[PDB]
């Protein structure tokens, strides 16, 4: 496509330049172009890809919530609120579909087990985002749960309980149980278990990522504090 004539390494450079400029749509476009070169991503490249897209859909979700709340209080008139909400919703779905397509078409393979946990977590996250706006839907919920579950099973076996990706996966999966599948008890259990088992084996923390483990473990408590 539009990135096809550029060197892979330049695309990676420009992705980093866009991040510094806080141009996350450009950042995602550069990383997508790099993935389409056909080469497996390094750990660093995976996380650049995730940062870019998660930042783009994050703003779309925030926007969508603002309009959905207005639309909800409008129903208690004019079609303009629904129309604009629908416009932002259709946009959000386009980006989610763009990422999920990239995951099945290119990234999810064959590859190592850590690789697979990373991508499978993204699969569950972006399916969760589509479920947040869908109706008619539970097909999307099942595929979010299945992607999450496979990611959990692999990570329990292949990664220490303090690994930031493993901790982040459980955090997000717990939220999925709560806000999506309507299972607060399962959401609470998974978050308490995840936090407790990380403390039991606190010694597995890594010099290169212990700050990310500390933060996600506080977030697990923040959600528990929020759900009591």
């Amino acid at each position: 496509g539009a990135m096809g004539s550029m060197e892979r390494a330049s695309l990676i450079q420009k992705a980093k330049l866009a991040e510094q400029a806080e141009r996350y749509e450009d950042m995602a476009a550069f990383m997508k172009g790099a993935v389409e070169k056909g080469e497996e991503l390094s750990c660093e490249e995976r996380n650049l890809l995730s940062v870019a897209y998660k930042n783009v859909v994050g703003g779309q979700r925030a926007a969508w919530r603002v309009l959905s709340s207005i639309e909800q209080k409008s129903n208690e008139k004019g079609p303009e609120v629904r129309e604009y909400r629908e416009k932002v919703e259709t946009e959000l779905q386009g980006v989610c579909d763009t990422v999920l397509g990239l995951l099945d078409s290119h990234l999810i393979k064959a590859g190592d087990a850590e690789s697979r946990v990373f991508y499978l977590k993204m699969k569950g996250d972006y399916y969760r985002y589509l479920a947040e706006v869908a109706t008619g839907k539970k097909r999307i919920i099942d595929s979010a749960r299945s992607a999450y579950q496979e990611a959990m099973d692999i990570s329990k076996k292949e990664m220490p309980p303090t690994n930031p990706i493993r901790l982040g996966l459980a955090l997000n999966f717990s939220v999925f149980h709560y806000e999506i599948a309507n299972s607060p008890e399962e959401a609470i259990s998974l978050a308490k278990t995840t936090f407790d088992e990380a403390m039991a084996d606190l010694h597995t923390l890594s010099e290169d990522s212990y700050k990310d483990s500390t933060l996600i473990m506080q977030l697990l408590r923040d959600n528990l504090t929020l759900w009591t």
Partner: peptide, 5 residues
């Protein structure tokens, strides 16, 4: 909303 990463 709760925390995600």
């Amino acid at each position: 909303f709760p925390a995600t990463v």
